[PDB]
Curated annotation (Swiss-Prot):
Top-level lineage group: Eukaryota
Organism classification: Eukaryota, Metazoa, Chordata, Craniata, Vertebrata
Tissue: Ubiquitously expressed.
Glycyl lysine isopeptide (Lys-Gly) (interchain with G-Cter in SUMO2) crosslink location in chain: 58
Domain remark from Swiss-Prot or TrEMBL: The NET domain mediates interaction with a number of chromatin proteins involved in transcription regulation (NSD3, JMJD6, CHD4, GLTSCR1 and ATAD5). The C-terminal (CTD) region mediates interaction and recruitment of CDK9 and CCNT1 subunits of the P-TEFb complex. It is also required for maintenance of higher-order chromatin structure.
Additional free-text comment from the UniProt record: JQ1, a thieno-triazolo-1,4-diazepine derivative, and I-BET, a benzodiazepine derivative, have been tested on tumors with success. Treatment with GSK1210151A (I-BET151, a I-BET derivative) has strong effets on mixed lineage leukemia and promotes myeloid differentiation and leukemia stem-cell depletion.
Cited function: Chromatin reader protein that recognizes and binds acetylated histones and plays a key role in transmission of epigenetic memory across cell divisions and transcription regulation. Remains associated with acetylated chromatin throughout the entire cell cycle and provides epigenetic memory for postmitotic G1 gene transcription by preserving acetylated chromatin status and maintaining high-order chromatin structure. During interphase, plays a key role in regulating the transcription of signal-inducible genes by associating with the P-TEFb complex and recruiting it to promoters.
Disease affiliated with this protein: Cornelia de Lange syndrome 6: A form of Cornelia de Lange syndrome, a clinically heterogeneous developmental disorder associated with malformations affecting multiple systems. It is characterized by facial dysmorphisms, abnormal hands and feet, growth delay, cognitive retardation, hirsutism, gastroesophageal dysfunction and cardiac, ophthalmologic and genitourinary anomalies. CDLS6 inheritance is autosomal dominant.
Organism: Homo sapiens (Human)
Record localization: Nucleus; Chromosome
Membership in a protein family: Belongs to the BET family.
Subunit description: Interacts with p53/TP53; the interaction is direct. Interacts (via CTD region) with CDK9 and CCNT1, acting as an associated component of P-TEFb complex. Interacts with RELA (when acetylated at 'Lys-310'). Interacts (via NET domain) with NSD3, CHD4, BICRA and ATAD5. The interaction with BICRA bridges BRD4 to the GBAF complex. Interacts (via NET domain) with JMJD6 (via JmjC and N-terminal domains); the interaction is stronger in presence of ssRNA and recruits JMJD6 on distal enhancers. Interacts with NSD3. Interacts with NIPBL. (Microbial infection) Interacts with bovine papillomavirus type 1 regulatory protein E2. This interactions may serve for the tethering of viral genomes to host mitotic chromosomes allowing successful partitioning of the viral genome during cell division.
Residue span relative to the full protein: 44 to 168 of 1362
This protein's name: Bromodomain-containing protein 4
Domain Bromo: 17-123
Length: 127
């Protein structure tokens, strides 16, 4: 029923790159999803305490959220686009794994994931 530490957003000994696909992931993908009317449940780690979800971190062992992803992008945590794409997919999958099918939160994730897929379909070829 307690919150775990959040996912890592800083690690000096992880090698890093700043690149055109990662720049698109920030400027196009993350920013598109972040501004959406259904983004708010996804903008920070799940607070299982305040939200009264004592089983959340029993079920979800790979937490991920857009606040973490935004920090990772802005703070140059990633080596490649696939790492970031994986974080988005983990976020969506967690939502579908935890929640009751058909609930509002699932519909919210689906709306964001539709846009995610639309944007990553046009991920640029690397420079
Ligand atoms: C991103 C994520 O999966 N968070 C965990 C659930 C957070 C609490 N919560 C819920 C619903 C919901 C809807 C909107 C915000 C928070 C919500 C809803 O539809 N079913 C009940 C749970």
């Amino acid at each position: 029923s307690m919150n775990p530490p959040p996912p890592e957003t800083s690690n000096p000994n992880k090698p890093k790159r700043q690149t055109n696909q990662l720049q698109y992931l920030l400027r196009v993908v993350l920013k598109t999803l972040w501004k959406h009317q259904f983004a708010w449940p996804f903008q920070q780690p799940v607070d299982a305490v305040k939200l009264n979800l004592p089983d959340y971190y029993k079920i979800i062992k790979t937490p991920m959220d857009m606040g973490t992803i935004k920090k990772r992008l802005e703070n140059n945590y990633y080596w490649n686009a696939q790492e970031c794409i994986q974080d988005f997919n983990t976020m969506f999958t967690n939502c579908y794994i935890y929640n009751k099918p058909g609930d509002d939160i699932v519909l919210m994730a689906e709306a964001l994931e539709k846009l995610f897929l639309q944007k990553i379909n046009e991920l640029p070829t690397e420079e």
